[PDB]
Symmetry: C5
């Protein structure tokens, strides 16, 4: 899994039937020390991640193992909203509670 | 998934027998800002996307989960035609 | 999938029993609009693609969905020999 | 598989229900020489790796094949804590 | 599949139980002409390759389709020892 931040959304009305009601978030990947990277993913989200939240994203067939994900032609999903990130025992980031 | 633009097609008469009737689009992947990359994918299309339309592309086994996709040796598929893309707060794209 | 040209062959006499009868082609990926890159793949082929032909290559578990691919440890296969590629209006490639 | 070192942790309380109990480690990938890359992965750990230890990480569907991994939406997992790594007639690392 | 050269080994005693007896090789990916790249993989080896031998590596779920690979959380395996590699119209490698 990669760490990313939620930074937008995609909407579509013409799409595979199996994607009805699927929320598509745009994610910007986060690098060392939380660098905003010039790289992005569009991902399904069944967890309920808000704008600017740090998340874990899973890619490949992992995405189909989200809740009700089985028949969906998705290759990226949000799987967790990040509460904390630590490095070498120091908190680097933490979430509003 | 990645955001891409439909910019071509591919056709083939000598191919795996399971690929009959599968339509292939050439796609160009979006970079950052709203600028496109010189990086392309050929993808199955069952959604019916046309030139210049923006799409979501899924890669790997996800591609086998398009309509009638079971057991087809494909690793890339258009899964949606995009109407809007927002980023940070503003509207980066609108059909 | 990616577009590549067939450019060679690999052979092996010590290998997994699961690769019995598998022909290996070396493929060179097409890059920068229509120029060939210094990036290669080794791929299975049942369709009969020859030197210099253009092909669609599928990677990952898609490769095991070629005819007789089931349960072989292969992660790349030629799935189609390319007749035509069209970018926007014009062609670009035609066999 | 890739070689990485354990450099931190991630926690989460809003997540997929299938991920209850999953320990998430932050891993830094090994680059050239024994230099590490500014490139990180967050991986499940059933083996019980700690800070500064070297591990093998498997990605993709492999990760679901760790003990109890089945049907968890994870795409990276620690699968071994490394004792040694050699390159040629010598040792790059020993615990 | 990628062409790689065997350039070391990894050992581990604390590891997923399904990886008992698995031999791990460190491999370096081949690049431009004969040049080997500054990128590497660790791969399960059930075929028996030695130092400096050239090998085909299969990655992702292919790796679980080696003999008895089925429940192993591995994403890379040596599937063959290369005897020959031919590219365009010259021999690049011949053991
Ligand atoms: Mg032929």
């Amino acid at each position: 899994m990669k760490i990313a931040r939620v930074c937008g959304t995609v909407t579509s009305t013409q799409k595979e039937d199996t994607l009805t009601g699927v929320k598509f978030l745009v994610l910007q990947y986060l690098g060392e020390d939380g660098e905003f990277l010039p790289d992005y993913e569009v991902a399904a989200d069944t967890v309920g991640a808000g704008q600017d939240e740090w998340v874990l994203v899973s890619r490949g067939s992992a995405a189909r193992h989200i809740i009700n994900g089985t028949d969906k032609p998705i290759d990226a999903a949000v799987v967790a909203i990040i509460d904390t990130v630590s490095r070498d025992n120091y908190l680097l980031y933490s979430k509003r509670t």
